[PDB]
Every structure is written in C-alpha cells, then in structure tokens.
C-alpha cells in the first residue's frame, strides 16, 4: 500500500513473504537466506502468467 518508492526499495532489500527453496526435491518455505539469491517480480504486480 505504501508509496512506490517503498516497494522499489523493499524489492531488493528484503525477500518476500515465504518464497520457495531451491535445489531441494520439493518446495518448502525458506527461512534462512544464507545463500538464497532470488528476486520475484510478480509480487509487486499480484498477477500470474
């Protein structure tokens, strides 16, 4: 809801709510972003392709 300069900032400065893990057999929620290097663009938009 907050101004877009808060979303562009929190786009990279913080990983979104509960993204999936990587290189596991199935997807869990990720809690320790040690070497998590992801960005998720549809979070801004709220649309699916």
């Amino acid at each position: 809801n907050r101004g877009l300069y808060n979303m562009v900032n929190e786009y990279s400065q913080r990983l979104g709510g509960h993204p999936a893990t990587s290189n596991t057999e199935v997807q869990f929620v990720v809690i320790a972003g040690t070497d998590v290097f992801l960005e998720q663009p549809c979070s801004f938009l709220q649309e699916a392709f």
């Binding site: 400065q13 913080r14 809690i31 320790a32």
Partner: protein, 299 residues
C-alpha cells in the same frame, strides 16, 4: 574465554523502539547458533511462537533446552550485543521480566516460555519485520506450579471440554486458570485446544501411573483409613470423614512387612526417574540478590 555474540539488524530500527529494547537489558534469550556474528531470525523465541500457527508450550519448552542461551548487554540502532551462557562460568543477571516476581536470595531460577502472556514478552520490531519474544524466568518453586496448571488443563478440558452447563468454569478456571502469588493474582494464558506434544507428554505420565498403581504399599492405605476417621489433621481436611471407596477395596488383605519392602523399593526407582520428566527446561542457581539493584548472580 571470549563469549559474545553480535546480532546485526538489516534495517535501522525506530527511535521509539530503542527505548523498549533497552528496558530489557540483562534478560536471557535463546540463540540458535553459537557463532560470533548472527542474524535476527534466530535471535528470539519468535520462530517457535509464530502468530499464525497455534501455540504449543511443550514445543517451546523443548526448543528452550536445545538452544544456547545468552544475556542481553547493549542495544544500538544497528546492533545488539550479547554474551553466551556456558556451563563453567558465572553471570550477573537482572530481573526485568514484566509480570513481576520477587526472587529469593540464593534460590534456583527456572526458565520458561511466555505463559502469563504473549503481549508481555514481545518487543515488536516493526522496522525489521520481526518480533523478539523473550522467555520468562521465575523462582523454581513457583515455576513447578505453572507447569502443573498447564498440563492438568489439557486433561480436564478434554473430558468437560465443552459443556453447556457450568461444568467448565466450575473448577477448571477456578483452579487451573490462575496462579496466585504473594498478595497478587497472575492470570495464565491457557490454550483453547492442545494438538501437539501436550498429550504426547501426558502419555508418558500415564505410562508411569499404570506401572506405579500396582506397586502401592498396602501399609500406607491402612494408615490413612484410620487417620481420616479417628484423628484430624490439616492435610486430611481434603477427605471429609468418608474414606474413598476404592481404598476400602484394595486393603482387604492383612499386612506383611516382606511385601511392602519390595514395593517401596521398586516404586522408589520409578519416582527417581519421574523427576527427569517434569524438568522440561533449564534451571539456574542463584548466589546473591539485591531488591534495590534487581541483579542476581546466576550460575
């Protein structure tokens, strides 16, 4: 030797909040990692006491023993500095927990998950999008009662679970709903429904009770049978004049000193092993205390 942990905050925390965290100085909280530099995500008890999932006090109990513990030392805009708690050391600890209890000099202290309230423990970090949930530490004598009140609420709110009559609230909240301390009544946060690990723990109790029930020495029952009717005592006011009916049924046989000696022996080994069941947490011993300083010397 050099026991310290610095937790770096990703985003600067607000001015109104730096006052709240500083009030919590010298308060224990459990760290996930025993390493010199860490993140916030492991800092507090908040991962196991998430707002979304239903609380489970025994689950938080197990987490408290697994974790390493630390004492809060310094609060900055960007960094929190702590010192770990190690077995072979001594620490100066402070009594800063919000539901207040006055510690006795030279008595053991027990650490426990936040039971008197979720609001009391949380210091919400709106900036870093987390909340730090401290544990609660009490004197050991009173913590043992708090543990019993929680367990007995699972079993009794199972039978009477929801009754349209006054069966619930007749005694469950009148007995188990609150702990009364010196000149004070502290209300307890009782979970509405226990699903995990609360019934699993009580199962291991009923395992002991079904063993022990066979090993009761008969000379003990025959003593109380007479004491309730003939003599009067403060302890025996619980039983009004009438004796329980079951005691009248087990006590048929005449006494034998040879039998009881082997019951009191075998039962005794099960009671020693019982003590390891009720612990469920780490305890700290005290050496000094100053009601004006609020600073004990735990160990």
């Amino acid at each position: 030797m050099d026991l310290k942990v610095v937790v770096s905050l990703s985003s600067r925390l607000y001015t109104d909040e730096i006052a709240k965290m500083q009030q919590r100085i010298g308060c224990i909280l459990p760290l996930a990692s025993t390493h010199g530099t860490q993140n916030v995500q492991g800092l507090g008890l908040g991962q196991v006491y998430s707002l979304e999932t239903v609380p489970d006090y025994v689950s938080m109990y197990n987490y408290l023993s697994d974790c390493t513990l630390a004492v809060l030392d310094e609060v900055s805009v960007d960094s929190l500095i702590l010192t770990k708690i190690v077995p072979g050391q001594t620490y100066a600890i402070k009594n800063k927990y919000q539901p207040f209890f006055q510690w006795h000099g030279t008595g053991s202290l027990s650490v426990m998950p936040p039971v008197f309230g979720r609001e009391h423990a949380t210091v919400k970090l709106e900036s870093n999008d987390v909340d730090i949930v401290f544990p609660m530490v009490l004197p050991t004598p009173i913590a043992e009662e708090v543990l019993q009140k929680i367990l007995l609420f699972n079993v009794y709110s199972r039978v009477v679970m929801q009754a349209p009559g006054n069966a619930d609230m007749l005694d469950v909240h009148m007995h188990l709903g609150s702990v009364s301390y010196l000149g004070h009544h502290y209300e307890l946060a009782l979970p509405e429904v226990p699903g995990p690990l609360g019934l699993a723990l009580l199962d291991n109790l009923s395992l002991y009770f079904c063993i022990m029930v066979t090993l009761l020495p008969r000379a003990s029952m025959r003593l109380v049978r007479g004491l309730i009717r003939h003599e009067h005592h403060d302890l025996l006011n619980l039983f009004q004049e009438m004796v329980p009916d079951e005691i009248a049924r087990i006590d048929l046989d005449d006494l034998s000193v040879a039998d009881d000696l082997s019951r009191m022996r075998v039962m005794m080994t099960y009671l020693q092993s019982l003590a390891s069941l009720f612990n469920l947490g780490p305890r700290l011993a005290t050496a000094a205390y100053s009601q004006e300083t609020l600073t004990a010397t735990c160990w």
